[PDB]
Write a protein that binds this DNA or RNA. Sequence first.
RNA 1: GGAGGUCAACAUCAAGAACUGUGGGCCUUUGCCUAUAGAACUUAUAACGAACAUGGUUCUUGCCUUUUACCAGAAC
RNA 2: AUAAAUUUUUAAG
Lengths: 27, 291, 93
Amino acid sequence: SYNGIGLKSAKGSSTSGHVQRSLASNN
Amino acid sequence: VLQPLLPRELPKLLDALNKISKYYPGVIIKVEESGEHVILGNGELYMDCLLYDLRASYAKIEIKISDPLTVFSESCSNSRLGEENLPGLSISVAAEPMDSKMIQDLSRNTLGKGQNCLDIDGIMDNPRKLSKILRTEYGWDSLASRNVWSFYNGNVLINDTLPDEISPELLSKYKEQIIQGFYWAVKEGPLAEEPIYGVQYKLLSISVPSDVNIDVMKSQIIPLMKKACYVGLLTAIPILLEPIYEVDITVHAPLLPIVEELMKKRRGSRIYKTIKVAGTPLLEVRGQVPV
Amino acid sequence: GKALNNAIPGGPKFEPLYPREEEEDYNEFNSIDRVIFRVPIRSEYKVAFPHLYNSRPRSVRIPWYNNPVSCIIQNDEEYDTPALFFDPSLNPI
RNA sequence: GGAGGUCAACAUCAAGAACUGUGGGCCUUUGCCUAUAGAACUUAUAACGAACAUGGUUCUUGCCUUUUACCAGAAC
RNA sequence: AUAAAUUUUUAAG
Ligand SMILES: [Mg+2]
Ligand SMILES: [Mg+2]
């Protein structure tokens, strides 16, 4: 789900706009 | 919590709130000292119905809205003194929790039919009949039963002090002032300035200046009585009350585990009843969750 | 989803339709110190009850909310099971 | 005279939730009020099509030497 | 206790 993270849309950003939760920092 | 986006458009927003209050009866609107506005409504979908009506039909302006929040209340769980700015009036107000059954019978307005505990709303009735109700039902105090003056929705007020025995009349003058300070006290609160609930106020003392006064005793009682009620509470181990919805869920049988998970997640985490629905592949799961 | 620039994890991604969010008045209203964080406010809320959770919607439509929760029960297994039969899924009454 | 036709022409199909005719009263035909008759097709998770293309102008972008050809949103 | 995926070519100068 798009929670407010990511980009307004991936057009000019040249990336794939692929976002994934960070297993790193949780607790 | 509403605020008009462009402040210069506020005089329109007000004029819409006066409509909504009429059209949707359940809504209760408050305004605060910061100019922000406060909407009180039954639940999610209902606030949706409003805010759509308020952005679309009534006030064509667009408005900023806070995070959805709730309403709290303030209670107590168990020397005692208070002072006026100009010590002609010295008040001491004790307060203690109300017995759960009492409150439980206040929240439901009840006419005392049969052996039911009467709702305190009968104050115009004989204090002997009402005292019969209290001493009969609650193991309530015998002296206090007569001592009681008046109540409000969440709480009741009681007098214990010697000058009542010494000078009941001079106080009976300003009783109607004390009840003003009392409603003015319940309407607000010490902590969040939100309603006090379930807090029994026993009035320990009142001090009156010499020469008495005419219009000084009129005004000077209300604010001091207020501060006497806050001060009465804050030493009582005050706590913070939160409402609870009664959740009603209807699910297919095999999905019952999933539902349970949600409860354990939401911190409401109480499902009291699981009722088979005769003939259909359903379950009524009755529970409770905070607002 | 489009007007609010939001996606259902399986739904399509569109353009903003209001490309400028950049304007922000520095003001006390939404400040963190004044907010209570309970529940994350997932998107599916903002798509579900668009006027409530979502500050400043534009060109948004009303979602249709709820349906009866179909209890329909049928048998594709045996052709010789009768038409009217008490299916073990049902409760015993 | 009935059934049809991968036949034609002429009407009508997006609106005050909305059509048309007629009787009567007022203003002076229009218009308002009142009475009466008939309303095919299309519409409420809104529409003739349980489907789904392109073009023009104007803005915002995206590629990025320039123009066609274009990138994806909006209004008409 | 995560399941979030942009593109992509021809002519003329
Ligand atoms: Mg040239
Ligand atoms: Mg040349």
